[PDB]
Amino acid sequence: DMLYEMIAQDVITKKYKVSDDDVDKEVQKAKSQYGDQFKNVLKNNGLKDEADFKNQIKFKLSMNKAIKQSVTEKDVKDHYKPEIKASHILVSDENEAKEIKKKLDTGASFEELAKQESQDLLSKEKGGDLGYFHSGAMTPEFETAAYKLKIGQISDPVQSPNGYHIIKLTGKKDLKPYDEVKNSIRKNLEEERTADPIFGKKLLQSELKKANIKIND
Amino acid sequence: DMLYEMIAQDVITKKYKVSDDDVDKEVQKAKSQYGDQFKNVLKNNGLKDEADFKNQIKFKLSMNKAIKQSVTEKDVKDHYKPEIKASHILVSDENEAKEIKKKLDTGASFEELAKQESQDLLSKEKGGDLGYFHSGAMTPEFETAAYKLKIGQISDPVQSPNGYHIIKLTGKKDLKPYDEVKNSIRKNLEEERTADPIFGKKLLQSELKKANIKIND
């Protein structure tokens, strides 16, 4: 509860050091941002006092540094892939995915079957079109299958945490040399991991485990 | 290592609160005690700087408060017993303890057998005499057996972490009413638990366990 926080924050703040100057600068950016409302927003955010806020900022900055250091050169190389465009149909039942594949193999419209049967509300009204996306945008299971396809090829059912996908590859962009794009791949992985609560929390559990400490969620 | 310390100290210092005024007073008592040598003794003690020392004093005072609160009214009542005097012979082999008992039952001298066979160097040259002691002075196994004896009675072999004891009760003091001596029993348990590293460390492991945290020694 309040103890887990202290400990979890102590492990991160001790390993990923940030200067009090950097912490105080982030604190001042919040004071000028709200002014005389600082106490209210601080109260409304459920913070004891300014000391609690500072400790929460120290944690955020240390966590940000930890997420930035979590990106290895191997991680950057593992995301060096061409941007691809694909369509998909998502269903929860594996037999339903096999029956969808059977219909597409006969010539049935991929777009119309996606509009009727896909469970993916973000793409079903576009006939299953996901548009162009980079490596790391979709689930690893989906990505692994999509990059194995040839343009126009339809996958067999692909299991992912979201259900079963029938995937059609529809586009592949030219890829610039690694040295030309590696800085941008690293920036993208840094941002995606920082904006992902699931990653930042799995990183905390692993960090406590590396320190030989077992706690409850 | 250095992380276990931080965490172990954070759990105790958070639960058993001590004022910064009390901590600073203990720090100043050390400064006037050594004067210009403070840095050297601090360096010789293996302390980073004065901040490290203060955190170690904060821990000591919080631990002292935790040990003082570990003494319950039940603990005081469990130590309300007359001071007793006993002699003993300590041997490591249970058959040797049975053979010693057989000899004493025939009339053999307890004092001479203790001088020859006892492994307890603190009492063997006194013929096994431990003098008068209060509840909590000896191991619970030894104490439990000693208080069951009648004056002059010899025990069968009593197993303790030290080996096997043959115990003879030789004295028992009058006991004042509980209300008259309970303050002194509490003071004695506070002091014995504070001067005992084994207790202070078993108290830390239990405190981490109450907080649902598993760490390695």
From Swiss-Prot, chains A, B:
A cellular component annotation (GO) from this entry: plasma membrane
**Which UniProt keywords are given for this protein, alphabetically ordered?**
Cell membrane, Isomerase, Lipoprotein, Membrane, Palmitate, Rotamase, Signal
Membrane protein topology class = Lipid-anchor
Which residue range or ranges hold the PpiC domain?
81-171
Molecular function GO labels: peptidyl-prolyl cis-trans isomerase activity
Q: Where in the cell is it found?
A: Cell membrane
Q: Reaction catalysed?
A: [protein]-peptidylproline (omega=180) = [protein]-peptidylproline (omega=0)
Q: What class of enzyme is it?
A: isomerase
Cited function = Plays a major role in protein secretion by helping the post-translocational extracellular folding of several secreted proteins. Important for the secretion of the protective antigen. The three PsrA proteins in this organism show different but overlapping substrate specificities.
Concerning its family, UniProt says: Belongs to the PrsA family.
Protein's UniProt name: Foldase protein PrsA 2
Organism the protein comes from = Bacillus anthracis
The gene for this chain is prsA2
Query: Which stretch of the intact protein is present?
Result: 54 to 270 of 285
